[PDB]
Design an enzyme around this catalytic site. Sequence first.
Site, PDB file in Angstrom:
ATOM      1  N   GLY A   1       0.787  -1.217   0.000  1.00 55.62           N
ATOM      2  CA  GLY A   1       0.000   0.000   0.000  1.00 55.62           C
ATOM      3  C   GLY A   1       0.822   1.271   0.000  1.00 55.62           C
ATOM      4  CB  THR A   2       4.419   1.907  -0.504  1.00 54.68           C
ATOM      5  OG1 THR A   2       4.670   1.346  -1.798  1.00 54.68           O
ATOM      6  CG2 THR A   2       4.743   0.873   0.562  1.00 54.68           C
TER       7      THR A   2
END
Lengths: 179, 230, 237, 249, 213, 98, 179
Positions: free
Chosen positions: E40-41
Amino acid sequence: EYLIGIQGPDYVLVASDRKMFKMSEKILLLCVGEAGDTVQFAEYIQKNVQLYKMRNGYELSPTAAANFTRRNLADCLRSRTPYHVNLLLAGYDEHEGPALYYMDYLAALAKAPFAAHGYGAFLTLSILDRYYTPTISRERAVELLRKCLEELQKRFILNLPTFSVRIIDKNGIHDLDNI
Amino acid sequence: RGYSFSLTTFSPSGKLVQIEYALAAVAGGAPSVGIKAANGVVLATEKKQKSILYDERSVHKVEPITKHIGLVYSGMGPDYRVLVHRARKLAQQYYLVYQEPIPTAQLVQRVASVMQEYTQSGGVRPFGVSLLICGWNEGRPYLFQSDPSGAYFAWKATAMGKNYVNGKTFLEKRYNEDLELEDAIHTAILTLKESFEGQMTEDNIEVGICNEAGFRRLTPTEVKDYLAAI
Amino acid sequence: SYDRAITVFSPDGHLFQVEYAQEAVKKGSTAVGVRGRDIVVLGVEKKSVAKLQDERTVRKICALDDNVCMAFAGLTADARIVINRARVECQSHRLTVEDPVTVEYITRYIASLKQRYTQSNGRRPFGISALIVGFDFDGTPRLYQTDPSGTYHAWKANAIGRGAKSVREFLEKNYTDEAIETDDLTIKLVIKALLEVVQSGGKNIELAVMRRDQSLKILNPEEIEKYVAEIEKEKEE
Amino acid sequence: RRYDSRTTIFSPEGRLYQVEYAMEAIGHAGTCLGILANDGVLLAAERRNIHKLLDEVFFSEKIYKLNEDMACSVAGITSDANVLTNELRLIAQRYLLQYQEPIPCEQLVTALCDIKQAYTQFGGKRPFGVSLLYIGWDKHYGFQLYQSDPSGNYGGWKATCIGNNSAAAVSMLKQDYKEGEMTLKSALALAIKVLNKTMDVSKLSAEKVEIATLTRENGKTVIRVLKQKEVEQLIKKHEEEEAKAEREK
Amino acid sequence: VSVYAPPVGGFSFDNCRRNAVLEADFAKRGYKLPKVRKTGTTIAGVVYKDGIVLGADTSKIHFISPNIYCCGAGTAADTDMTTQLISSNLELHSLSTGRLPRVVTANRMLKQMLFRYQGYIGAALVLGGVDVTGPHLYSIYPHGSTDKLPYVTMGSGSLAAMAVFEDKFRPDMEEEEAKNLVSEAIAAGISNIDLCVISKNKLDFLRPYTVPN
Amino acid sequence: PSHPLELSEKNFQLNQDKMNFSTLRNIQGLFAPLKLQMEFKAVQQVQRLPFLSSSNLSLDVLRGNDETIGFEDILNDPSQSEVMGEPHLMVEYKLGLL
Amino acid sequence: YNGGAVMAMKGKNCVAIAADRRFFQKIFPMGDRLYIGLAGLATDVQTVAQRLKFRLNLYELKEGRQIKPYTLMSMVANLLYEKRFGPYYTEPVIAGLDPKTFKPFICSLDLIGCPMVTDDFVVSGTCAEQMYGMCESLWEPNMDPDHLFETISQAMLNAMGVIVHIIEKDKITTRTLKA
């Protein structure tokens, strides 16, 4: 509803609650569960084993029979979700010898020297582990079985049947006294 | 004569005649050669469009399958196109499943298996092509051939098409095992020149090579340079 | 003409391909079956005993279930499919109904399976005929025959294959209520029937015996030789 | 003939001419031989792809490994043989997955023969023109050797031959095979003699013959393909023994 | 179906009921089960004068074709499988055609394949490349929706990076300025920073296509 | 059933064919879907027996799937199936006799 | 239900794989110098282990060569990704040596098959965070087989016995250990 089994150097000892089924001349299938599901499974397995014997002229080994039963139970669990069957399997080989197989309700197969089912477990398994030896004789195995039942009955429990026992050896299945 | 029309009928002597006729159709195509050298493989063929009214970058007879595999044919072009597409799809499927480029032998086996099916059912016709496949795997070259019946062989050097018996005879006495790529190209062009029936130019033949760097089709300038060299 | 397709009728009402499928049966080894009082006996001729052959894999007598056995004559590869299908159907019917299957039931199943293949031009019939014999639940011996066309009948003694005419002619006069009194007498009768068309002594005989509440048993060559010697001694006397 | 256009028609005397022609197609292939001994099984074949410009890849051209316990050899049409061998491997793996135990040899042979028979009964299909020999070991009967036909028929043998000069090879094996007292060395010598007398070549060479052996060692089955040095030694021994036998006359 | 029917390939739905019972049973007995890996970066992208700049922090920048690159967020396995399948399809297309592929073809393929499975495959993608027409930048969502924008952001630090773009984005920039803007926007959300640069001057659309190494 | 996607995944080619046929009938006329269906049936009527794996080359060319790879081609290889029935039973089932 | 714990560590021309034991099988051999470990539901572990051997045997028969660890990883990933919507409850771990180069290789996968190749160590199970710190603290490069065995045994023990397989170029060592 309880099952118990002890394997010896050249024999297999089992005892049920008064539930055994006969698949071959040297194979037994002890199953326990909800009525109406544990009879159809045994009938299907017996018919398939008989068909194999008829087609090939020789008999299935306990190992192959146990694997067949495990695969069939796994396939059956995927369709009928309210299905709950617990069973054991004992046999004898001309090549290998005695064999005892343990199976849970999620179709997991394990080969163990001794096993148990039903409400009476844990402490019975611990007693069997403590008092078990690979070179145990039939009389000593019967003595351990009787002492395990005596120890289990004192815990505010009542045993309705006499726990009929059977023996599987090179000769075949023998019926013993209800002890 | 009664057994010469049906594909699924055995002759009283135990022969299948339609496969022989498909092989005869193969034997009437344009010549093509293939030589396996010590460090590469070379494929050569003779073009069909021998005219000035032909657009050069429209249709090619030497095609790549993967970065390290290429092939040439002799027979019917329309049958060749669909087999090329199927081979490309099979190679991509193998790479997707195994995360590794396909070996030449596996691709040849799959293509031959596809070809075999059209020789055992009624209402269809066998393919009228024969393929030459080259590759580079594990630091060594490969060269294969595939018949219309679905059988494959591994060769060191071979010729097929029009007048191929004399081409094989020439290759038998002109071939050396410990041979480099440039001399292999020279030998292939000479074998093609043996039965060209005309005057060769860099615009009516096609050449492709395979080595450590991968399969590659030669440009007309290099072909002209080689022709001038020999 | 009128014989190049399976489903073409002759101008006088004949299906010639199904009749040609029986010429293959008429060329197989002789098989004899006799129904006794409390025993059933089968017998098959052994032909072309090769020196380097294994006899275990070329047997022509099979056990369909615990109380049903069968012998066949005709194409060897076609019989295997029918035997396997019957073996599966026996267990399927045992699942359906707990009681053991009936000889007539399995004969009807085999007949329907054989008849299914005489309906279309895309498949060819089975070129075999069978002798189905066994015991019922009550204990009454039974004997049946099946044809390549799909018809079946009940018999007291029959023969198939080459020599069937002479074997049946012998049986019609040698089958009485006295020759089936005992198991030994029934076995002797079957051996005598086989010996009419079989030369080179009793070395080309395969015998099978089934009794009540028992399984199929295949007689040994020594036992066959003993029976043949007894028959020869009685004939000489 | 009006009764030999397809596999789904019977002759007036009850024959299948298309199947007979398919079986006749086998006589054009190379010679394959198999011998059963007391402590092993043998398979010898004849190389047909002989040419100066042919390459040598794979381990063999006519002998295939089916599983850890079985091997086969084919004679007929290579394109059909490939399909048959792939199906055999699939069947063996399916049985192993089902039962957690290796498949018996007779069961495998019957499974393939059912498929081969199914192609001679439904119209619109051409029967396989392939014959096969099988060798293997199992816990029920030990060492075994089988044969198969394009029609779907099989049988168990102690010594047999398929292909060119099959009748002559069978006659010689029948004349000079001993039952119950054979070893691997004697089986190899007999195979060399039979192949020498069968192949229409004045002098036998090690580059046109391939031999495979199956045996049991320490509870494991070992399948190996003999080397050219061993084949040359066997041929030299046979030649010198023949010279000795001729001279002692 | 039936045991007499031939098998077919694809996904399998055999363990659905058993898993549905087991998950609730384990929840109401107090036991844990394995889960899936997720990412989820922050990922970003900018369209500059003659190319595309793609950035991600730590590789998460996938390969589609010699002129197209992608970035993903969500379940890692889904992004890997979708990228590999689309790359194989585009390679087949380029081999058949003989020219370098187009960004719209990849966008259409991804849209249709994500819409076919009704969002059960969780993969959000940022797609960019350079064509004969020019540079294009897209953004694809797990349910099958797409936007064509001059700059996009996805991940955790989406708000800060979007603010940085809305504050400091101008059309027709340079390579160094675009790279600096992307790096600053990525750092505004938080490791290191990974940059991918696709340039029009390093691509030749006139020579015949060849399989890349 | 068990999953929302099971029935959708099982019936995809049928729905795609129906959509293409409806659009073609609305745009051109009744003849084009008729011809397409007849070609499909003709090229599909020839193949191996059901207990062996086929290739479907002409059908794939006609449908247009000769340059596309899906999840049905890389997952659960139908050629290497783990279960298979008897040949005669499969052939009879395909004919509708069962 | 407890699940399990599988660990793998890399040394100098040798690898080690370990699993816990209480006093079902969790480590299966897939080659001469190739092993795979599974943790999770017993039924799913058995099903995956039995289905992988089918494909491996077919591949080795058709190809004619020994398989590489990377190819085994890819096959496991494909088999796990099929059945993506209802998954098996397994977490594979792979450790082995290159059949032709003899180079160490370790890997780890998740529920649906997302690989992770690591240079020093991998950890799987429900206590990955508990054992990650111990593995980071007790690992050093270029370890001899005895040192590698000792450190992997300590890592297993500091978080009921264990079993450790040590894979060498020319031998395989199996040791059962109790705290």
